[PDB]
Structure 1
Amino acid sequence: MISLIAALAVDRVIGMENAMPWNLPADLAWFKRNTLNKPVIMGRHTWESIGRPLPGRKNIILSSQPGTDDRVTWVKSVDEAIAACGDVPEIMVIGGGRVYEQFLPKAQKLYLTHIDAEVEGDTHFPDYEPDDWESVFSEFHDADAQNSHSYCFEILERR
């Protein structure tokens, strides 16, 4: 399948000129657990923001331009990105906004972290058609020493 994973603040904000507005290590740890040993597809701006390869995962970068780093795989279209992933039980699409929009209709599963934080962003998760998704997992966490906002991990499956 194809699955999207994202962390959403209020109103589906996911970023602000190429930095995430927070630092919730419980959520990054959820991200790592759900992506480790799977291929991850990302757009070029998200590659830039991370700033390095994600270890333990096949990193596939979409760009309409030649690639500039041979430590990751560069592809020029959605069909090529999926093909580069070969024979894998689960393909993880890790954003950003433009990439999420294109992979949504080919997604079976959404791993969403809803963060209770108010932030004034420039990129959104495409979100919304609720009727087409069943929530099968939801786990809510209050803020603590390490994590300054409350947040909820949710897994949705396409009905």
Structure 2
Amino acid sequence: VGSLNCIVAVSQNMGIGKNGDLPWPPLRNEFRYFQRMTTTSSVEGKQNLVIMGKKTWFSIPEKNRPLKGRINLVLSRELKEPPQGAHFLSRSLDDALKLTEQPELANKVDMVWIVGGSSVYKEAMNHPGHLKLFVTRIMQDFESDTFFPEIDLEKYKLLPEYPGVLSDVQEEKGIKYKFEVYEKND
């Protein structure tokens, strides 16, 4: 099992969701970026693992689920079986990262990508050691009822040129944003 990563798109007001939807209108090229970052593994014969909370799983548009080309694992204490075609269920990130060592997943998973929601991102941010955050900073406020946690710049550093990540400001539907990559050690 490879590198642990979060990926999020977040408004200037730190928002990531509202009533089970995104806060902003669809940004197709931003969705393409999510898809290419989470799907791409260069270890031959393996796939990345995408980890999401119960509510994020049900919220993602159903005709995209499970996320193709990726192993889909849902975190819940409530569910007793993986919901709707997800491959795996665990109670927590720690349990998920354990399962990754068991025979069924051991020679199957390259990178891990945490894809939401808020309590899952908090768990990952609280997880000791290396974590890379791929943050799309949407440069205006949108009304949100769920939020991404603070990024501690004493722990994370921006990585200003990242291969396969556009540096310049992007725009779709009049809404500007920037793809950013952060990394922590500790």
Q: TM-score, normalised by structure 1?
A: 0.89
- Residue 80 of structure 1: CA displacement? 1.7
Question: In 1, are the aligned partners of 2:118 and 2:148 still within 8 Å (CA)?
Answer: yes
Determine helix, strand or coil for the equivalent of 2:13.
helix
Paired amino acid for 2:31: L
Determine helix, strand or coil for the equivalent of 1:11.
coil
- Greater gyration radius: 2
Q: Does 1:137 align with 2:151?
A: no
Q: Does 1:151 align with 2:177?
A: yes
Q: How many residues align?
A: 157
Paired amino acid for 1:19: D
Q: Please give the alpha-carbon distance, in whole angstroms, between the structure 2 residues aligned to 1:84 and 1:92.
A: 15
Tell me the percent identity. 29
Q: Please give the alpha-carbon distance, in whole angstroms, between the structure 2 residues aligned to 1:110 and 1:129.
A: 12
- Residue 89 of structure 1: CA displacement? 4.0
Q: Please give the alpha-carbon distance, in whole angstroms, between the structure 2 residues aligned to 1:63 and 1:39.
A: 16
Question: In 2, are the aligned partners of 1:38 and 1:92 still within 8 Å (CA)?
Answer: yes
Q: Hey, what does 1:31 align to over in structure 2?
A: 34
Q: Please give the alpha-carbon distance, in whole angstroms, between the structure 2 residues aligned to 1:8 and 1:96.
A: 12
Q: Please give the alpha-carbon distance, in whole angstroms, between the structure 1 residues aligned to 2:136 and 2:100.
A: 25
Determine helix, strand or coil for the equivalent of 1:42.
strand
Question: In 1, are the aligned partners of 2:13 and 2:140 still within 8 Å (CA)?
Answer: no
Q: Hey, what does 2:5 align to over in structure 1?
A: 3
Q: TM-score, normalised by structure 2?
A: 0.77
- Residue 70 of structure 1: CA displacement? 4.0
Paired amino acid for 1:5: I
Q: Please give the alpha-carbon distance, in whole angstroms, between the structure 1 residues aligned to 2:160 and 2:33.
A: 13
Determine helix, strand or coil for the equivalent of 1:82.
helix
Over the aligned positions, Cα root-mean-square deviation in angstroms equals 1.8
Q: Hey, what does 1:119 align to over in structure 2?
A: 142
Paired amino acid for 2:26: N
Q: Please give the alpha-carbon distance, in whole angstroms, between the structure 1 residues aligned to 2:97 and 2:117.
A: 16
Q: Hey, what does 1:80 align to over in structure 2?
A: 95
Question: In 2, are the aligned partners of 1:85 and 1:91 still within 8 Å (CA)?
Answer: no
Q: Please give the alpha-carbon distance, in whole angstroms, between the structure 2 residues aligned to 1:53 and 1:75.
A: 16
Which of 33, 41, 47 is 2:57 aligned to? 47
Could you report, residue by residue, the CA deviation over 1:12-42 in whole angstroms, capped at 9, with x for unpaired residues?
1001011002211111111111100310000
Of 86-95 and 33-42, the range deviating more from structure 2? 86-95
Q: Hey, what does 2:43 align to over in structure 1?
A: none
Determine helix, strand or coil for the equivalent of 2:181.
strand
- Residue 129 of structure 1: CA displacement? 1.0
Question: In 2, are the aligned partners of 1:140 and 1:151 still within 8 Å (CA)?
Answer: no
